[PDB]
Amino acid sequence: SLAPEDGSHRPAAEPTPPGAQPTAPGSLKAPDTRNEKLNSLEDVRKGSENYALTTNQGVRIADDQNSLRAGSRGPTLLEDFILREKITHFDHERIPERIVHARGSAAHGYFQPYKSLSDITKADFLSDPNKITPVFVRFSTVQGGAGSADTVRDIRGFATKFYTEEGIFDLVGNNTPIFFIQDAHKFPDFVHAVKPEPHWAIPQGQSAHDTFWDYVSLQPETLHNVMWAMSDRGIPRSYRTMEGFGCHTFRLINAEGKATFVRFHWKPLAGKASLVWDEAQKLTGRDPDFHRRELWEAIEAGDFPEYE
Amino acid sequence: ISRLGGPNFHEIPINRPTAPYHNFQRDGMHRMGIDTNPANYEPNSINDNWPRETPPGPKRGGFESYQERVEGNKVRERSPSFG
Amino acid sequence: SLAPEDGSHRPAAEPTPPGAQPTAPGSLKAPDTRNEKLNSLEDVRKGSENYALTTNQGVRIADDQNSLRAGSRGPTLLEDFILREKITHFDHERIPERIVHARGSAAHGYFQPYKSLSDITKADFLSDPNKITPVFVRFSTVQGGAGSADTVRDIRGFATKFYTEEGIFDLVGNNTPIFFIQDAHKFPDFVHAVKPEPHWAIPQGQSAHDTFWDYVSLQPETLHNVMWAMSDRGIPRSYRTMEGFGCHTFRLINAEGKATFVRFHWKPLAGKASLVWDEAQKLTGRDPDFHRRELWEAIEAGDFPEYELGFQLIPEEDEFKFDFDLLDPTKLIPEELVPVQRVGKMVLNRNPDNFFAENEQAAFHPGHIVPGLDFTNDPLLQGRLFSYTDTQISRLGGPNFHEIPINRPTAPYHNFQRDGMHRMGIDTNPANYEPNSINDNWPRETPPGPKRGGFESYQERVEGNKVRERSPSFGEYYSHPRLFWLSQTPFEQRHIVDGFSFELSKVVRPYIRERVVDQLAHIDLTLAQAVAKNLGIELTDDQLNITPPPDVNGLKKDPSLSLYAIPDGDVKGRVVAILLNDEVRSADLLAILKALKAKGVHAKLLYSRMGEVTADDGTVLPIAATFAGAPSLTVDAVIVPAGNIADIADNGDANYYLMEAYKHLKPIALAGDARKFKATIKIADQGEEGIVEADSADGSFMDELLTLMAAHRVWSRIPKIDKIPA
Amino acid sequence: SLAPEDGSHRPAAEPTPPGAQPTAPGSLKAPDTRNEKLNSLEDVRKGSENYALTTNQGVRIADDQNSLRAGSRGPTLLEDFILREKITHFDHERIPERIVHARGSAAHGYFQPYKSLSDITKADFLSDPNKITPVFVRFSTVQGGAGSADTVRDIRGFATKFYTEEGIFDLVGNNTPIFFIQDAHKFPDFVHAVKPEPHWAIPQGQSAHDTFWDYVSLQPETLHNVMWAMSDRGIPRSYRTMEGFGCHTFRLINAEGKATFVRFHWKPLAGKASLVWDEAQKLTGRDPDFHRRELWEAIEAGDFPEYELGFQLIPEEDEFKFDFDLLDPTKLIPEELVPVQRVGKMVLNRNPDNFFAENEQAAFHPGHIVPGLDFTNDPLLQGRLFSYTDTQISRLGGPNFHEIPINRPTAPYHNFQRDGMHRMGIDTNPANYEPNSINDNWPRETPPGPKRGGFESYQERVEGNKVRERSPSFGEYYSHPRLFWLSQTPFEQRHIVDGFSFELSKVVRPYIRERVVDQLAHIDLTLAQAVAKNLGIELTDDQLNITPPPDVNGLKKDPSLSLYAIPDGDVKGRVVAILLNDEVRSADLLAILKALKAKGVHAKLLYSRMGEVTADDGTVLPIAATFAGAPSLTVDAVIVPAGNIADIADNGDANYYLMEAYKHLKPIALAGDARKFKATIKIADQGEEGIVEADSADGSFMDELLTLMAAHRVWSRIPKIDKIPA
């Protein structure tokens, strides 16, 4: 036994305020929280306590501190499959990050409509106020890599996967109601311009460089979303205190075949709040994980993020 | 790694062991297993070091190589006895 | 046409100081800087001026602003192949980042030896002072992703690809002489402990979390490299101002086949310099690209990064002459015991053209050796040899990663290997096997020899049983930490104390902090007490009584382990901030810039807005940045010239600038009415060592300033900064 | 030195007939055959002779016969990086095969138009008879894997990559003028039905199984292309002797902006020829590489595959003037209604160097069009446009597949796309977006125009609601099957009946057979009754009274649908087996061989063993193969010279050779005492059409034989083979 005798290594499995306990995986922190989706992931959840350490082929390992060598100061032997399996898995841990929105933080939850919307849409998840729909929601920035800072000035993404009884519906929104460009053919041009410049790969997490402002100056269509980004909207206090929008006109379709144009909104029930620029920027240095950390600690505290 | 697309090939259903498997390896493309262990390294105190090594023994023990004697120089050379 | 009339969109193709021009791809900035490797990449460089915009298939595009749709407000059509090809390429731009050292910055250069080393190695690139070897070097942090910050506290990588006439040699080193662990089998454990924790993926770029300190507390072999990381070694000022090390004992082999043990060193000709913790941390927010930018702009300016390659050489009969094992990569070889022989100089003189094609796709691997070099049984090196080949299969997409241009050897390569994903080479050999008769057995094996021979391993004797067992000779963990500790200046010691104290305070589980303090007590009681004090821990009686570890072969210190004990400062390439006012005394600025130019020291003119101000004699002075846009974090020293000081005297930003520079131990210089600023930093009328002040910026004023800059920081100021609110 | 001293290991670099020399990489066999694309590949071609064996990193290897081990009987060491590189590259050689057309054989050549087509298309490759366009052509089957057999019953692919000065144009066609299905959404259903069944992965290279015929029985739109596959079209003699078609209506666009609907044709200049089923099926066993081999050896011999490009052109005003919809890919356009206009000639004159690098990695896609061409709303074509770009992302590892050397345009290509796996091009452009001012907006869009203009889609009118709906105009399934059937000779019709019979006999569930027979009864009663008889199925009174579908625009046949109704034979490049005996009449063999050589017909001298035999006059005759080693399946005719016939008269293999060649309708010629073999194949004393016989191989003997060969097979023999035990 390496754990301290007083059990102070294990976080209390109950709501506790930020800083009071170490943070923990969700199913350990909050085992009593459930929904249909969380239940259905049980078949792949893997525990650990009281199990033997093995290879991926289920062979127990006796010594996980040393490679196999010819004498204790000798060369490592090619027949050490336990070493090569462990190093092979490590060697291939990384997958490509998202082209955009690479940096983001996610949580499980649920959604319920206030009333049946069957007069305007036949979407099953909106047909019955007792119908509860599990969700998984990822918030993100846009420009920076998966290892970039949270409190940058940037647009934020707000993507919700609804696991409905008639299929997955993903509402893939941002925290402003519009976008910089009109036609998708220009998306790699715009994204290239805001991303780090291609000779030297600078700057990270920032639109404050030549190519972004060149593109804007030559494409006045971008000005509307640029105003938003230059406002304090570009530096939210928390993912809990920003608005979400669906970006486009979509349609609702009812049982009768009637189409109604719709634009989607998320209203933060915690209200709207942003940082100020000097604060936001220094914070990318003092804690580049601030919004990720704040989201996780809100949920561990029972300060559940809520959106209408 | 190329044929089956990465290091999680043991999670492809035909290839899965029916014996238990638990270790500190993580991630890789199309990762199926969701690990709950607070720890992804050992030695650890935060999960009281689980999953744990197992001494070798008569049954249900850890793997240990037979301690064959090795004596020779580092050579790229075919044994004469093979000729 | 979109470019300005005046041509000010294009940077001059001549060396220019930082900030004077927009930065540019290296072949456009410095078209006449050449080496065999840069020249050999010409087949793949692609220009752009005067060419038509096309698909990848060579079809000219008429309208690159719109999708094809049925009516101008209609749906997009599936037959729009121009749109889909463009979006397809975009959708697939990213490749996996490196498992470790994902964050890094790279440059082209060359290496040349000081003399022939044929007496000790048959390595062709070391055979003649005339042999110029192109190199491509990538500097990196370790823990954070490719989009993490530069000035974190971390170990740094220092990887050099030598394009030799006898093959690629990759020297894949770090900025400290040892590693955290002894055996490669534990690498995934250590790296997972240091990396963001698996439930929530926090923290980025930091060792300051429970799992890292948990592992360290359970694995005392780590303590030596941990001492290095907690020192100011972990926060270098610049990739130009850090040491590099090969980490392991390798062998040199000569033409007679004699083996000599070797450890590799890179000595920075710009001297050793690091940041202080508060400045580094804040810098990760003000400019997370600081080291990448500083490297690129140093090369653009002509401040080429220079390093001397150094060998510590130990004869094979001396293997057991030290009181540590030469194969233990947690042990250093003190230079007092085995001096570094200076062997050649490397100069980085050209930036890449496309970061992703040349930097992100570069593959370095320490098993890439050439005849004249060989491995040892170091159990960390041993396992590295497996990892750096294997990891490229996913990262670079398959086994043809040597065909990616930056990776290609300039030496010939021919063999019977075929196919694999994105195979470039089209082999004409009728045979794809040997022995073969159908191509008269070509390409053919080559016997080992003094030059241009095939590779043969040194015939080391191996005797022992097949065991998974750590050598008993590796079982000593505290004497090297202690040697390092005792070799640091008293201010370097204070910063080590602060680094442990700061990191451990971020460990939420108190027993982990307690266990680390117990390990410190095994190294040095004074260290352990100072850390404990900052954590509100009291040493027990047993801990007060642990006997110190032995000296290292009679050594009770080695000043070569200190960044600063032996003076080594070089001011060329450093930068000063000059805080302007709306009517600067022009005679101050003439002298300041004059004397800074003569020592190669750069300047940034700063003010409260952009544009220009005008000096007292009508000289127009362009403003580089605001006080808040280019903080003192980014400069080595601050000068305030005389003039209308009332203009800035009550500027919060201007006052803070000097407070922050003051707190970070930087030289400050104040002329005439600028001495009014002494009051913001609490300087007595009589002055203070590290504050330069005079009636005007005359000749003696700049000499004293440049003297301070050669010594990097004003360490004597440390007891004054505690009271300053900054 | 392992090569023979006599140099007989190396083939002559001159054209040589099949079998005379070992085959070789194209650039070694025919170094002086050149075109712009072959020249442009020189940067990646890697030789071998006189070069040292190295790692991929350029390190010379001394011992490529052994792993590094501790002792010559000890364990292999992880530090053996030479072993691990070599085995790593091997371990990763394979890439995914193509989802369909995985089996294919390719060659280089060139195309030239007969005259400028500027009045109907601005396509630069068709603008000038003196403009030569390099091509790379891949022929394929459809269902089987890359390691399946060539002479299966299947559709064939005929894909041509034109490396034009205004971009790559890929004409991705098949050997029949229609496809099985109407809408691309159904392509996975169709392909899955014909592919090996998913429980057990059987059968390979065959539509003869339940699921294919299930799908056909339930999707009558398939019946037209099924008629083609069941005919001898499904079993070509050679890729040189099949037609090619572009499958869909596309558009030509001229400089004035006029659109003309076009379907593409390739006419084989060597004539149309196919195998017979028993032969084709047995050949998949005796030489599953028979078409790949035949192609490669045709090119080595100088019998270059030549095709004439032709267009069926239909003016925009005539879109609705046929009984069938022009956009329906299950309908052909009969040449009687719309003739093929000759456009130009393609010659395939050089084999690749490395099959993997050039053939396996080639990417063809029908969306790769150039200005002067455009698409139509054909709903199969429309979905193809999505598939051929998407699939390369796994098959070829990413979006940089255009940088794989065979796939590169010879036209310039420049744009703002960056990165992706395997990125080769190092872009120096300061900008990676447009519009940009920092590179003066280069590379720039180009307006459309008469030559060298940007691509702009033809402004076709679209009007309709968003629907998933098949056009009513596509709802007719039997008239084209019937047009095809009525156009075939009586022997061809017989082979169609036998194809359906054979296939349906492999369908295990009898109801599926019954349902297919019911569909046949909607096409033609005679066809339906004959298949029914072979399956032991009796048509119902209702089936016997189904009224036949209408003629196609008044056509009751179109002879251009037949392989054979209009003679188009060409003996050049065909091959004859010559059955030797141990004392051949040398005067017969001189006459035979020289007559064959004069018409470009090859010969293979066969016997009961390898080595030599000696003619009557002492001439030493080298043996190419044994009777069993090179069966009659692989030749077009058989000649037996006179001499010591008793030597082989009783050889079972020699007799069976004649029986097999007899059954498969091949010309046979017997000189002098070789006429004793008449008894083996049952020929009357007075002789029969299709058997050449005389006292000696002089006079008209060889002319009569060549006349038979010009007509390909002896169809009149069909009633005679019915009862031959062979």
Ligand code: HDE
């Ligand atoms: C309206 C909200 C919004 C808008 C207007 C866009 N994004 Fe997003 N994006 C991808 C492509 C893409 C395109 C082509 C366009 C306009 C043409 C937009 N974006 C604008 C993507 C490259 O396919 C993307 C990256 C990886 C991926 O799977 O999808 C992508 C990301 C993305 C996210 C992140 C989703 C997540 O995993 O958290 C969000 C919230 C948006 N986009 C919103 C969005």
Ligand code: HDE
């Ligand atoms: C008209 C000639 C023709 C037709 C009508 C089709 N094929 Fe082909 N094919 C692919 C997909 C595809 C679709 C989606 C459809 C109708 C919707 C067709 N086919 C019918 C493919 C999966 O994208 C394919 C496989 C790998 C690849 O790169 O493309 C593909 C191959 C193919 C070839 C082989 C070209 C070559 O690589 O040698 C040929 C000659 C055809 N198709 C013809 C074709």
Ligand code: HDD
């Ligand atoms: C057994 C696993 C292992 C071990 C024990 C080490 N390494 Fe490593 N290293 C890798 C496995 C690895 C790697 C996973 O293979 C990387 C990341 C991806 C890459 O291409 O190689 C790598 C990258 C990497 C780089 C960056 C190369 C680049 O810039 O692209 C450097 C500088 C080092 N390593 C240096 C070291 C040092 C100084 C070590 C101790 C002295 C060390 N490595 C131990």
Ligand SMILES: [S]
């Ligand atoms: S949007």
Ligand SMILES: [S]
């Ligand atoms: S190391």
Ligand SMILES: [S]
């Ligand atoms: S087709």
